[PDB]
């Protein structure tokens, strides 16, 4: 198997516009949305057809209740912040949670805050610790390490159970998440060399240029990965071209264990 | 389906110890409590166990292995007022708490 | 600083009758939950209310509702008391749920028998 992971995301908002809600949460499988929930609907909800195909009513509806818990937890931990930095305005609150299985059979574990989209509180299973970026973080992170049992559960959260309810989705979803499309590569002129793909799933690829078999890293210009709608993925690197000097280019592309040369004549 | 077992009763001699043990089967765990329940009255949290080990807190530890899926509670230097029902509740993958049916403590003066 | 306050502590009812048992706490809990404790077997989940405003159905909802009013008040109402609801009930409250580590605070018990 690849590496796969299993994150899930929550965001509060103080003085969120109107209609827009103060509260999101959304599970994801690799760049696949699974789960959502949001304090308008206030309802759990499938974002991927092989989670409402295997996951039973009650699993919702637990979840459901769950959420509406953490959403008013987010909320009262939100306020303190902003008590706390003493700031007005609408300002925002963040966690992501989550576990990767490395192809090879090892795992990684991760929880973090942010507020205001930086850092704040950054989790470290293995000293049972948190890490505090600043002096509201250490407030915080000095009531949250009185709680030992609290440290010792999410340990053991990101250890053993995130991993099982990730193996358990990966095969709920194995015929999407499993699958592997080969991408198309083309190159063109347009003065500088586009190496362009499109495509592929899964979206991890490497693309470069190498100039008579070096690579030119710092003169390489690479494109993001993009989503294409269908499912697949599409991507590009450029390379500026010498007009003092003949040299042969060519891309490299590396994908889901196949690698791919194109000369350019 | 989800299940926890302990004794029903146990009896013991003040002044001696006792091994109350708890096995689980569950689907995921979130963490092991022991409760004591005096005959009449309310429940009262003892302990929370959620990796291996064993923890003290005063003449009670409370021991717990996650690949045997089994637990303990152990008292020390029996006193009279220990005689009670423990109750043994492990948290599966939803946090649901599954309950023991408990173990009634007797002990012989 | 009182804990869980729940009433009454006992209670004699005929088959068919209404009852409504009264839950408080005052240590500004958030998740409350009704248990019945029968004899042989472990404690049982009747409703429970992870948040203010919200509730739902334990493993024995059927015969019981329940109103959270507000933060502190979660009641448990038998609407036509039957012979099986003889028991001894619960209210608990924690901080929060949905984490492992938190662990409930227990109300003085119920007792009701119900006869035909």
């Known amino acids: 198997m690849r590496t796969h992971s299993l994150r899930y995301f929550r965001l509060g908002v103080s003085d969120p516009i109107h209609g827009v809600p103060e509260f999101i949460s959304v599970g994801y499988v690799d760049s696949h949305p699974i789960t959502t929930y949001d304090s308008v609907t206030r309802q759990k909800e499938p974002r991927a057809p092989w989670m409402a195909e295997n996951l039973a009513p009650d699993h919702w509806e637990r979840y459901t209740q769950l959420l509406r818990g953490w959403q008013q937890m987010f909320k009262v931990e939100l306020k303190r912040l902003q008590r706390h930095y003493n700031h007005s305005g609408s300002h925002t609150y963040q966690r992501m949670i989550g576990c990767e299985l490395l192809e090879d059979g090892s795992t990684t574990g991760f929880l973090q805050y942010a507020y205001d989209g930086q850092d704040f509180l950054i989790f470290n299973k293995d000293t049972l610790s948190w890490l505090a970026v600043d002096n509201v973080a250490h407030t915080i992170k000095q009531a949250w390490e009185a709680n030992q049992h609290e440290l010792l559960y999410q340990k053991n959260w990101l250890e053993e159970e995130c991993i099982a309810w990730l193996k358990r989705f990966l095969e709920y979803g194995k015929d999407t998440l499993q699958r592997t499309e080969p991408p198309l590569v083309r190159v063109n002129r347009k003065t500088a060399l586009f190496c362009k793909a499109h495509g592929f799933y899964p979206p991890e690829i490497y693309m470069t240029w190498m100039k008579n078999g070096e690579e030119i890293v710092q003169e390489i210009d690479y494109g993001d990965i993009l989503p294409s709608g269908d499912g697949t993925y599409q991507a590009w690197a450029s390379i500026e071209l010498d007009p003092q000097s003949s040299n042969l280019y060519s891309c490299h592309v590396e994908h889901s264990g196949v690698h791919m040369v194109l000369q350019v004549p | 389906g989800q299940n926890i077992d302990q004794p029903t009763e146990m009896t013991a001699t003040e002044g001696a110890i006792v091994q109350i043990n708890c096995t689980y089967q569950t689907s995921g765990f979130n963490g092991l409590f022991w409760y004591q329940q005096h005959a009449g009255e309310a429940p009262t949290f003892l302990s929370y166990?959620?990796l291996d080990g064993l923890e003290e807190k005063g003449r009670f530890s409370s021991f717990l292995s996650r690949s045997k899926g089994y637990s303990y509670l152990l008292l020390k230097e029996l006193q009279m007022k220990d005689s009670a029902s423990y109750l043994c509740?492990?948290?599966?993958?939803?946090?649901?708490?599954?309950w023991g049916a408990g173990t009634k403590l007797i002990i012989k003066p | 600083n009182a804990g869980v306050t729940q009433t009454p502590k006992f209670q004699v009812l005929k088959t068919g009758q209404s009852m409504t048992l009264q839950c408080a706490q005052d240590?500004?809990?958030?998740?409350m939950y009704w248990y019945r404790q029968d004899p042989g077997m472990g404690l049982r989940l009747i409703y429970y209310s992870a948040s203010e405003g919200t509730t739902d159905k334990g493993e024995v909802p059927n015969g019981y509702n329940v109103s959270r009013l507000n933060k502190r008040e979660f009641s448990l109402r038998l609407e036509s008391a039957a012979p099986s609801q003889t028991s001894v009930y619960f209210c608990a409250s924690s901080v929060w749920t949905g984490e492992g580590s938190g662990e409930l605070f227990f109300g003085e018990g119920s007792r009701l028998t119900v006869l035909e």
């Open positions: 240590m500004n809990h958030n998740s």
């Open positions: 166990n959620v």
């Open positions: 509740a492990v948290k599966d993958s939803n946090y649901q708490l599954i």
